[PDB]
């Protein structure tokens, strides 16, 4: 422990990037921390109420490693992922179905869409790879919504429903990132 504060000391989690009554997520970037830049590693921790859900999402450049430290977590994950194929028809959109535990590791690739629901006041550890200025783009919810950022006029064109349908549903879920597992 000691006292001589100086020679490459330490780093801990001050604040969530995201805090909702549903959960929290602390996150150190090599942009914030002085040690890290040098590894190209993102630190992250989270706190998920015995009920939350991480809203459908992807990291633009980060392949996240996630060990479940406390609890049991259901992992949902999508991806199209292997072009060493001579066309598209070939490769497919498979769904990654999996729930973890107290020793489980899960790697989340750079642009893959996933969510985790809570099946315990579950604590998650995740180390961020290739992570020099990575965006946590969100496909659902209120915040961090990209969709919502697609204009009325592209929307129609972009999914049967138009300004109406499209515009409105995104607007239903007045929550954020972490959300009601409210299973049905």
């Amino acid at each position: 422990t000691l006292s001589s504060q100086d020679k490459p000391f330490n780093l801990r989690s001050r604040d969530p990037i995201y805090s909702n009554n549903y959960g929290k997520l602390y996150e150190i970037t090599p942009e914030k921390n002085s040690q890290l830049r040098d590894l190209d590693i993102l630190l992250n921790c989270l706190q998920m109420n015995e009920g939350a859900l991480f809203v459908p999402h992807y990291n633009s450049r980060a392949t996240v490693i996630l060990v479940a430290n406390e609890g049991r977590a259901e992992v949902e994950l999508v991806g199209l992922e292997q072009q060493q194929q001579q066309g598209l028809e070939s490769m497919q959109l498979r769904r990654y179905a999996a729930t973890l535990s107290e020793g489980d590791i899960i790697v989340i690739p750079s642009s893959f869409p996933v969510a985790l629901k809570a099946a315990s006041d579950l604590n998650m550890v995740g180390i961020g790879v290739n992570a020099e200025n990575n965006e946590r783009n969100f496909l659902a919810g209120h915040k961090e919504n990209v969709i919502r950022q697609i204009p009325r006029q592209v929307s129609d064109l972009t999914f049967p429903g138009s300004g109406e349908e499209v515009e409105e549903l995104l607007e239903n879920q007045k929550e954020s990132y972490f959300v009601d597992g409210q299973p049905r």
Binding site: L93, N137, Q149, E165, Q182
Partner: protein, 181 residues
């Protein structure tokens, strides 16, 4: 291709998605053929044409892009959490469009096609390029439709019914789309 002439000259793109309204072809990864081009093995070269009055439907790349107009009048839009970004593209007008963004472009009114040259700078699966389209098409649905009703209803809180019809169509000859506008 494969085990053919180890040269530094290629002429066969691979057509991923194809319809008559536009095209999208991929140049084979550099090193396939030769043991001589293993640097750039993590770099794909893309070509993309379309015809006048088109919308390239929304999608995001895992890969860092480079976009070059090898002939045409464009309008590019990159989209985030707090806003959209909006620039009209032109011959030469080359832009950097970094990993992950969800992007959609168009061809405006001035008569002809738009040929785009796209440069990909890869890193998840080096060399390896992949674009997740938002919506649904003939033989490649959406991505949002990969999880289930459960996981999805949860997220909007309006049913797998409402949510579906708005999210799940079959945009016919569609990745590349036409308009009145």
């Amino acid at each position: 291709a494969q085990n053919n002439p180890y040269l530094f000259r290629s002429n066969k793109f691979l057509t991923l998605f194809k319809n008559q309204h536009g095209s999208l072809r991929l140049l084979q990864r550099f090193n396939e053929d030769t043991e001589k081009l293993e640097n750039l093995r993590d770099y794909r070269v893309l070509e993309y044409c379309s015809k006048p009055n088109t919308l390239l439907l929304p999608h995001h790349s895992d890969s860092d892009l480079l976009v070059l107009v090898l002939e045409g009048q464009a309008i590019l839009v990159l989209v985030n959490p707090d806003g959209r970004d909006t620039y009209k593209l032109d011959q030469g007008d080359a832009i950097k469009i970094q990993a992950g963004t969800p992007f959609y472009l168009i061809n405006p009114d001035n008569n002809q096609n738009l040929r785009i040259l796209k440069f990909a700078i890869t890193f998840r699966r080096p060399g390896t390029v992949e674009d997740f389209f938002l919506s649904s098409t003939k033989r490649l649905p959406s991505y949002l439709s990969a999880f289930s009703k459960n996981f999805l209803e949860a997220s909007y809180d309006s049913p797998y019914d409402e949510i579906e019809q708005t999210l799940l169509q079959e945009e016919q000859e569609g990745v590349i789309v036409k308009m009145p506008k």
